[PDB]
Amino acid sequence: ISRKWEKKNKIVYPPQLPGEPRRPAEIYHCRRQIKYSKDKMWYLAKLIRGMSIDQALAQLEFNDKKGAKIIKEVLLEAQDMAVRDHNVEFRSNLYIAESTSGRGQCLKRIRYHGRGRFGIMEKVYCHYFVKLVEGPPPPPEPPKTAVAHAKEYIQQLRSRTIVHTL
Amino acid sequence: KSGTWWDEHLSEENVPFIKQLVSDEDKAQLASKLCPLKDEPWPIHPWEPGSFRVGLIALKLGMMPLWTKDGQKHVVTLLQVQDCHVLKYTSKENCNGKMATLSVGGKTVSRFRKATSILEFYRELGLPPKQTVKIFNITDNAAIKPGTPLYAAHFRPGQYVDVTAKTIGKGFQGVMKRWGFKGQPATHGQTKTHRRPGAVATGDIGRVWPGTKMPGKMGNIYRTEYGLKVWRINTKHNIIYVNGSVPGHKNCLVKVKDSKLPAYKDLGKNLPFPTYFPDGDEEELPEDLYDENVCQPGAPSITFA
Amino acid sequence: AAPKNRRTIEVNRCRRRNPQKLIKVKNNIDVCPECGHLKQKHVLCAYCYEKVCKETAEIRRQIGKQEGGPFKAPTIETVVLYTGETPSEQDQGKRIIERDRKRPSWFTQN
Amino acid sequence: ISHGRVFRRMGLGPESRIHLLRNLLTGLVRHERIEAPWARVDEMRGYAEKLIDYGKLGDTNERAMRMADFWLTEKDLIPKLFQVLAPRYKDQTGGYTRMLQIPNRSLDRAKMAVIEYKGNCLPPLPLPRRDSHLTLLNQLLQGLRQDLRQSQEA
Amino acid sequence: QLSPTELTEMRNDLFNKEKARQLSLTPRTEKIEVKHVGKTDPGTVFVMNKNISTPYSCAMHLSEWYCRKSILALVDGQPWDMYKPLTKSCEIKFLTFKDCDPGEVNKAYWRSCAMMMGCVIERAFKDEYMVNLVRAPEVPVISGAFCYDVVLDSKLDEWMPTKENLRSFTKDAHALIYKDLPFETLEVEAKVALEIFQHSKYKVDFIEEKASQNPERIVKLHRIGDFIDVSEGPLIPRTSICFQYEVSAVHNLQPTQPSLIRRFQGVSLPVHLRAHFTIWDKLLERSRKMVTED
Amino acid sequence: TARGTPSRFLASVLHNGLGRYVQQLQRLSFSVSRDGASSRGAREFVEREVIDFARRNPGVVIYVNSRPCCVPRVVAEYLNGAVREESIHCKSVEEISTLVQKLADQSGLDVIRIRKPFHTDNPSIQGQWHPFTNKPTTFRGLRPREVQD
Amino acid sequence: TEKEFMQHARKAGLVIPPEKSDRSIHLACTAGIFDAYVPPEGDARISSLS
Ligand SMILES: [Mg+2]
Ligand SMILES: [Mg+2]
Ligand SMILES: [Zn+2]
Structure with missing residues (x-):
């Protein structure tokens, strides 16, 4: 097995001189061996990806999927140790950086079928990973405007050379 | 970032006030257009051969039996014209077509459920928003100034009209209900085959021809019925009695215009052109305009010869 | 019918990660004016609905204890009374339920 | 094709549908406030509304007594309907019940609803309230109402 | 005299110099126990920094719902600006637009929109013309529109704005809303404000009367972008609070022979109280009518 | 293949040879084992040729380190920073001399398409x-x- | 198929080593001061009065 996510909270950076700006706080948290499908949990992780911690909690509270409450508690305890142990001033000044699911250890059981046949069913388990970064969520990338298309097309036309010659 | 409706933040004392305020304004706007011939009307031209006038939008009320002096019974669909007006005019050159177009609407609805662009378009027109808008192909001499109301008297008894409306939807349906396939026998060994389409194509092509009759959605599409004559017209309620049945359910909006059949061309010589103007009329129309063959309800019982 | 060829992960990603397959963001979430917990616009607040049920359950428990038997529904009105309360002038001839508690602020007395 | 079909297909059939509605109605009569699936609450609401109308007819009316006998499985509730519920709504011509949406139950995430008879002795539900008249939008509309009111009277 | 582009530069410099001075006289780090009094999440205690922390900072401690919804802060029963630094440990309460009695919130919003609309007056007209504002009347909300008193040059005696001119004013305000400038407040001595607005006689009169009614003889100055105005009472946190903006019309007060007074008028509505297009249209018609204080 | 290998245009280093030619080889480091059959070719090479090669190229510095090793190596450094490492594992003397001479003439640029x-x-x-x-x-x-006026 | 996890873990702290054992934990220092010494008030001023 691999448990690198837990150790990611134990790395310490050297003290920063006043010249350089403030390094935003980051917290790595994960819950292991959840009785859930990693594919099903992926949708919830992608949904709350890139949003604020409190907005994510509101979205997860009213979601009907079972995995929603699991992530909600994981986000709640992640916010707790962030302020308590990670020098986070404002508990609402956090946004989700990366949220994803990984396959856990699963058992193999027999599913009976007719005519004496059988099928190997699998009790799926999965992990959930989440990283929280202090500060307001970054703005989403604006749609690429028509003028942006215009200059890009000009650049391609200006970057062409006479090929297969001197 | 959150959706909203008109009465979301209104208190208990403000909801009735707003509801009556818009209601009063809507009635005032509608009543301000009752005199089109005095509000600088467009020039009126005499009828000429090959001229096409504007149509109407009505609401399908229902059907009643109707008898004639011959003794036969015919069913008639009640088409009521309510709040029908001309919205805008597009010239032939602007509309890049063979004939100019005219926009007509009807069945005024609430302003709180309309788009911002539509609301401001009706704001300058000085009319409440309509439920549906239809485009009629007309000639240059048949132009009508926007804001002019229209009535069921635009048509006359003995005239053949065409009606187009969306048919009654029936959702996803099988081949038997949709295309009238014969199906399969219910007994004699048939196994799970009683409404199946069966073969869809031949084996050599190795594909399915486009347009093949297949199970799918039915209805909720625009269909037009031709060759429908007008037996009776009610002036007071603005109701047209068109012969036969028309597509669409009850209380549905149907676009009405003159018949396009070749045998019925050049029949608008005596019809109003470009439309009927009750305000400028010298005389008042009767309550009901009947057909020559239509027996009036108050007339004595028919005795045949 | 059986699959003819194995579907590649590129095709599966295009299907599983389709925009309509994703969970849509809800924009009808607001804070409850009373308790401060999240609630939907058209749905009663979970905190306030649940606290009413517990009080209702306690009163109903007192209802049955005073009732003391099935098929004995009273033919009179019922009024619940809290500690330090007396029957009102209009509260006469109606079944009285005694609650060993202080009347809640949200439970306005008629 | 279901056009104009005003009755839902619930339970094991028409007999089961009536029985399920009857059980919900009986609990609504006895407890004055019940919670049930949203669709079942909406269907049962019409039957609950009409019960008081039969109750207002009086217990001496034989038609109402037969209807109350069938629709109330517990016979002790019949005196309550004819002597408690009906006198309470004698001045009210409609809307005896109010129906609200509650958060979905955790068992199966079903759409839940609560229906209760008005004028009950239970603690009031957290009914949704419209905006107060003292807010900025209401005040501006109130000012428009007054100025319009003073314009027409003069 | 001094050009307008340099007048803003020196006024901003004076505002920054005063703000630095207020921070300098303040000690490094002191703790004030601010207790949260309200119907939601009671008993919470905020140990913040004096003259550094703000009611907004306490709001971020709880959740973003307070930050987004709380338009005004209630300190010890008197209104407090959202971004105004706290001076002592005291109980705190937050107010929203959709409250039982949002009278102070509406009044704060009414004065906030006056400054925004008042700000675009100077930038609207030509550089050759001169514009000197008089004051911001405390017009009631129920009047239907907020008003600002402006005086124009002797060239525009008979000049009245048309529809396009009023449209241009709205476009500038919407750009001002789009830029999302927070409202910055500063409590300063009367003499300090007098030298800031020494080039405006009306502002000098406004400062001296504000100091007269104030026993401490201190006035509050609010800053938006590069614009500084003398306003009475707390304002909304940022310019993004208002959603629908429009200036109704321009009216001339009487008499005009001693001095020409132009009463510009407009109406606004915030995001939390968004209205329908038809409802907003009727409010615009009502706001176009002239309004006077009682 | 070309599609799977980065390419570059033909070029020189600082226009070498335009005014004068500057030898691009700058440093050579040789690893030789005193005992071991793998270094016999490397050993005899430095007995008779490394002296003559040094005199031929005065601008190139040659280092000969004698340490135990299983694979003799030669490392070439150029003025552009490129480093080339060639093994001398079990080769003769006439072919290391050609190998060493080849690195001298190279300009140090990447040997790609x-x-x-x-x-x-x-x-x-x-x-x-x-x-x-x-x-x-x-x-x-x-x-x-078109027409005018 | 019958394969399962090895989830036989019982919560265990570090409280008491097994008893009736000659070997015992050797302590190097005491838990707390044997007698508490109360500092006199005003010792900060006594610091000035060296
Ligand atoms: Mg078997
Ligand atoms: Mg249908
Ligand atoms: Zn609540």
């Missing part, structure tokens, strides 16, 4: 072709099917 076998900063002296190069000009330059 060359897009063009020629390179020049001035491909044209009379001007590059443009659509108007062979187009006559009419009176006042009137466009086709």
Whole structure:
């Protein structure tokens, strides 16, 4: 097995001189061996990806999927140790950086079928990973405007050379 | 970032006030257009051969039996014209077509459920928003100034009209209900085959021809019925009695215009052109305009010869 | 019918990660004016609905204890009374339920 | 094709549908406030509304007594309907019940609803309230109402 | 005299110099126990920094719902600006637009929109013309529109704005809303404000009367972008609070022979109280009518 | 293949040879084992040739380190920073001499596919072709099917 | 198929080593001061009065 996510909270950076700006706080948290499908949990992780911690909690509270409450508690305890142990001033000044699911250890059981046949069913388990970064969520990338298309097309036309010659 | 409706933040004392305020304004706007011939009307031209006038939008009320002096019974669909007006005019050159177009609407609805662009378009027109808008192909001499109301008297008894409306939807349906396939026998060994389409194509092509009759959605599409004559017209309620049945359910909006059949061309010589103007009329129309063959309800019982 | 060829992960990603397959963001979430917990616009607040049920359950428990038997529904009105309360002038001839508690602020007395 | 079909297909059939509605109605009569699936609450609401109308007819009316006998499985509730519920709504011509949406139950995430008879002795539900008249939008509309009111009277 | 582009530069410099001075006289780090009094999440205690922390900072401690919804802060029963630094440990309460009695919130919003609309007056007209504002009347909300008193040059005696001119004013305000400038407040001595607005006689009169009614003889100055105005009472946190903006019309007060007074008028509505297009249209018609204080 | 290997254009280092030629090889480091059959070719090479090679190329520094090793190696460094490491595991003497001589002539640039076998900063002296190069000009330059005044 | 996890873990702290054992934990220092010494008030001023 691999448990690198837990150790990611134990790395310490050297003290920063006043010249350089403030390094935003980051917290790595994960819950292991959840009785859930990693594919099903992926949708919830992608949904709350890139949003604020409190907005994510509101979205997860009213979601009907079972995995929603699991992530909600994981986000709640992640916010707790962030302020308590990670020098986070404002508990609402956090946004989700990366949220994803990984396959856990699963058992193999027999599913009976007719005519004496059988099928190997699998009790799926999965992990959930989440990283929280202090500060307001970054703005989403604006749609690429028509003028942006215009200059890009000009650049391609200006970057062409006479090929297969001197 | 959150959706909203008109009465979301209104208190208990403000909801009735707003509801009556818009209601009063809507009635005032509608009543301000009752005199089109005095509000600088467009020039009126005499009828000429090959001229096409504007149509109407009505609401399908229902059907009643109707008898004639011959003794036969015919069913008639009640088409009521309510709040029908001309919205805008597009010239032939602007509309890049063979004939100019005219926009007509009807069945005024609430302003709180309309788009911002539509609301401001009706704001300058000085009319409440309509439920549906239809485009009629007309000639240059048949132009009508926007804001002019229209009535069921635009048509006359003995005239053949065409009606187009969306048919009654029936959702996803099988081949038997949709295309009238014969199906399969219910007994004699048939196994799970009683409404199946069966073969869809031949084996050599190795594909399915486009347009093949297949199970799918039915209805909720625009269909037009031709060759429908007008037996009776009610002036007071603005109701047209068109012969036969028309597509669409009850209380549905149907676009009405003159018949396009070749045998019925050049029949608008005596019809109003470009439309009927009750305000400028010298005389008042009767309550009901009947057909020559239509027996009036108050007339004595028919005795045949 | 059986699959003819194995579907590649590129095709599966295009299907599983389709925009309509994703969970849509809800924009009808607001804070409850009373308790401060999240609630939907058209749905009663979970905190306030649940606290009413517990009080209702306690009163109903007192209802049955005073009732003391099935098929004995009273033919009179019922009024619940809290500690330090007396029957009102209009509260006469109606079944009285005694609650060993202080009347809640949200439970306005008629 | 279901056009104009005003009755839902619930339970094991028409007999089961009536029985399920009857059980919900009986609990609504006895407890004055019940919670049930949203669709079942909406269907049962019409039957609950009409019960008081039969109750207002009086217990001496034989038609109402037969209807109350069938629709109330517990016979002790019949005196309550004819002597408690009906006198309470004698001045009210409609809307005896109010129906609200509650958060979905955790068992199966079903759409839940609560229906209760008005004028009950239970603690009031957290009914949704419209905006107060003292807010900025209401005040501006109130000012428009007054100025319009003073314009027409003069 | 001094050009307008340099007048803003020196006024901003004076505002920054005063703000630095207020921070300098303040000690490094002191703790004030601010207790949260309200119907939601009671008993919470905020140990913040004096003259550094703000009611907004306490709001971020709880959740973003307070930050987004709380338009005004209630300190010890008197209104407090959202971004105004706290001076002592005291109980705190937050107010929203959709409250039982949002009278102070509406009044704060009414004065906030006056400054925004008042700000675009100077930038609207030509550089050759001169514009000197008089004051911001405390017009009631129920009047239907907020008003600002402006005086124009002797060239525009008979000049009245048309529809396009009023449209241009709205476009500038919407750009001002789009830029999302927070409202910055500063409590300063009367003499300090007098030298800031020494080039405006009306502002000098406004400062001296504000100091007269104030026993401490201190006035509050609010800053938006590069614009500084003398306003009475707390304002909304940022310019993004208002959603629908429009200036109704321009009216001339009487008499005009001693001095020409132009009463510009407009109406606004915030995001939390968004209205329908038809409802907003009727409010615009009502706001176009002239309004006077009682 | 070319599609799976990065390419570059033909070029030199600081226009070497334009005014004078500068030897691109700058340093050589040799690892030789005193005992071991793998270093016999390397050993005899430095007994008879490394002296003559050093005199031939005075601008190249040669280091000969004698340490135990299983694979003799030679490391070449160039002025552009490129480092080349070649093994001398069990080769003869006449072929290491050719190998060593080859590194001297190399310019140190990457030995990858060359897009063009020629390179020049001035491909044209009379001007590059443009659509108007062979187009006559009419009176006042009137466009086709147009009139003036 | 019958394969399962090895989830036989019982919560265990570090409280008491097994008893009736000659070997015992050797302590190097005491838990707390044997007698508490109360500092006199005003010792900060006594610091000035060296
Ligand atoms: Mg078997
Ligand atoms: Mg249908
Ligand atoms: Zn609540």
